[PDB]
Amino acid sequence: STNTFNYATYHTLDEIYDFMDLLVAEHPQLVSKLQIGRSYEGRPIYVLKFSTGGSNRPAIWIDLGIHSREWITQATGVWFAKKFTEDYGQDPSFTAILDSMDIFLEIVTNPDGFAFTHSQNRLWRKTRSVTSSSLCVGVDANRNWDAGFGKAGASSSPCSETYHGKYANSEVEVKSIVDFVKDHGNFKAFLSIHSYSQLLLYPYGYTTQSIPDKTELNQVAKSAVEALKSLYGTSYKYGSIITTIYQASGGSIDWSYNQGIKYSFTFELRDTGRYGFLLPASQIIPTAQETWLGVLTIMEHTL
Ligand code: NA
Numbered sequence: 001s002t003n004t005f006n007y008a009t010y011h012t013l014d015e016i017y018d019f020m021d022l023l024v025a026e027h028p029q030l031v032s033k034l035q036i037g038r039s040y041e042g043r044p045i046y047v048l049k050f051s052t053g054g055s056n057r058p059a060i061w062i063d064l065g066i067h068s069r070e071w072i073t074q075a076t077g078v079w080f081a082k083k084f085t086e087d088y089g090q091d092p093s094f095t096a097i098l099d100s101m102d103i104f105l106e107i108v109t110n111p112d113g114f115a116f117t118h119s120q121n122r123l124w125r126k127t128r129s130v131t132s133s134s135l136c137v138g139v140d141a142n143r144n145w146d147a148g149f150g151k152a153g154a155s156s157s158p159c160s161e162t163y164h165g166k167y168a169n170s171e172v173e174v175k176s177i178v179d180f181v182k183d184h185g186n187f188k189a190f191l192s193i194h195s196y197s198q199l200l201l202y203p204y205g206y207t208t209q210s211i212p213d214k215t216e217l218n219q220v221a222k223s224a225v226e227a228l229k230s231l232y233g234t235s236y237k238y239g240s241i242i243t244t245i246y247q248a249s250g251g252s253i254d255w256s257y258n259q260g261i262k263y264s265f266t267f268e269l270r271d272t273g274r275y276g277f278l279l280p281a282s283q284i285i286p287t288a289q290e291t292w293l294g295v296l297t298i299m300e301h302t303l
């Protein structure tokens, strides 16, 4: 069951997908498993929908593991999924959120990459799409979105780990999300979960121009990082992608924000570089716990 599932170890794709099935079997009135598309290599792409009912009500999007090597993110997503089912009807604030909004949680946004990080290359970042006139494989799915696509902050080289692909939305992993979010039509928050560096970022990455909601999003981010820090003292910086991490084009939250999804943020989880991508499994639960407080804070503001 999801009660005896080990949340304190890193899991395989099959184990995470199996976890989804268990959670849905245990909580059919709250959680459903949606298939939003197929990966390049033909693996199902799964989103968990958390809903108390209503008619096409406003929604929160959360993607994790778009960059496959960032194992702390998929691990945090599994923890999140369980947490939602525990806290609904128990925590007044989360109850209020799920009473007015649906949450769509995509734990493994890049399943081909995730498989590849277990089988061949632990540090694999990109998708696994074949590039026609190249010996190199894959596209950076977080450089592939239709928001300043192909501008500075991505590579045009197929062998680069920040290769943007031939055109915006070329990667089915990205197109599946775009289609789903657009078809739904009523997303109010869009949160992309990455690692590492302990940052909470808002748009833009592709341009130095500040967003018109900078004051509000900056305050939300400030509040969220203070909530996060309250648990273990984990210090996060916050600000726009471009001013806080680097210039990056074709990124997810730049796209989502441009769709009018005001509360668009990217988390960069633990750590700052001591362990980096190879954050030990004993850090999964404390990371997920503190990150939850930050995410909940954003959800409260979206509410
Ligand atoms: Na795997």
Ligand SMILES: [Zn+2]
Pocket (backbone or CB within 6 Å): 067, 070, 142, 194, 195
């Ligand atoms: Zn990333």
